[PDB]
C-alpha positions as a Python dict, from the first residue, in 0.01 Angstrom:
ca = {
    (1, 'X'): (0, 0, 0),
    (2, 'X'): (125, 369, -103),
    (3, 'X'): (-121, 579, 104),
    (4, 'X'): (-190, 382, 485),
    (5, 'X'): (-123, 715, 660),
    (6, 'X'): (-101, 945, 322),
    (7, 'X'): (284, 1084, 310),
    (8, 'X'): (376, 1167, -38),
    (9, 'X'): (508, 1532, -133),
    (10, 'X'): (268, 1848, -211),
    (11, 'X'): (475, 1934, -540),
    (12, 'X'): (374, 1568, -661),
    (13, 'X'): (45, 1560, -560),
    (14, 'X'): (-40, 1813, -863),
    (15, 'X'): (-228, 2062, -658),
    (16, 'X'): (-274, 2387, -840),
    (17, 'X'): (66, 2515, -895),
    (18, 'X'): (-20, 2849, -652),
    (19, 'X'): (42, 2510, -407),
    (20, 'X'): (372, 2346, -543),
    (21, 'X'): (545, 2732, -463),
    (22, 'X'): (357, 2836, -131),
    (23, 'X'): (268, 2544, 40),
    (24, 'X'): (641, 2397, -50),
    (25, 'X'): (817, 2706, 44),
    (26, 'X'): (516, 2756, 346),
    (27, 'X'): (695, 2487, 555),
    (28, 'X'): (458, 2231, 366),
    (29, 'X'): (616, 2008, 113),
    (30, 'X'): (366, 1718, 179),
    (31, 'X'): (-7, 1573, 210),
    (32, 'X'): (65, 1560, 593),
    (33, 'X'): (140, 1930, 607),
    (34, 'X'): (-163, 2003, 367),
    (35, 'X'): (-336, 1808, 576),
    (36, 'X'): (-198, 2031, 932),
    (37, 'X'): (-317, 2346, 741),
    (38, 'X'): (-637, 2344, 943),
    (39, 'X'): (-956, 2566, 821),
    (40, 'X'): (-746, 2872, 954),
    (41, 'X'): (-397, 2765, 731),
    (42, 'X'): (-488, 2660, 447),
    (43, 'X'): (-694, 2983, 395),
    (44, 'X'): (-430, 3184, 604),
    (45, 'X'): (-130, 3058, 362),
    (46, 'X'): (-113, 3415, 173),
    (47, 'X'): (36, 3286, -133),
    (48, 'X'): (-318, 3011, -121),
    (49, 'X'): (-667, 3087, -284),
    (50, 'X'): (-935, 2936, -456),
    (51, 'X'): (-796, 2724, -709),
    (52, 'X'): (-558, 2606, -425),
    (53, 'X'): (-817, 2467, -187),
    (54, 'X'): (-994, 2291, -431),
    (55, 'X'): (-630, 2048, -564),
    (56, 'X'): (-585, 2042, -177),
    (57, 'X'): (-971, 1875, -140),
    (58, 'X'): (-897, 1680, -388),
    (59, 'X'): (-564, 1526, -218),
    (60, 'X'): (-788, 1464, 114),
    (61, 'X'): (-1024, 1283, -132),
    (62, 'X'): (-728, 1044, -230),
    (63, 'X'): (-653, 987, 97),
    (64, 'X'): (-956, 1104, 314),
    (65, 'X'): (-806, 1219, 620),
    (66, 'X'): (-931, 1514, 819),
    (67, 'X'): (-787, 1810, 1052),
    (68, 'X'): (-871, 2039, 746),
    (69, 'X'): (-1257, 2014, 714),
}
């Protein structure tokens, strides 16, 4: 298995690119990190919008974990 805990790196995952740059450089180069950016991160990340939180969703629909939702 490739995804019992999710742990694979943000600039793979192919979130929107607005992603690969700020969540990489925001101290988040994972799924785990994305997945620490609660409701008030992910949406706090200055460099993240829109088209962000949607590839992000999308990653916690590969994996389904929580602690952003």
């Amino acid at each position: 298995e490739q995804e019992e805990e999710l742990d694979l790196p943000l600039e793979e995952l192919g979130l929107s690119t607005r992603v690969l740059h700020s969540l990489k450089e925001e101290g988040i180069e994972s799924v785990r990190a994305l997945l620490a950016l609660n409701l008030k991160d992910l949406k706090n990340i200055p460099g993240i919008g829109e088209r962000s939180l949607e590839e992000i969703k999308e990653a916690l629909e590969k994996k389904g974990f929580t602690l952003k939702e």
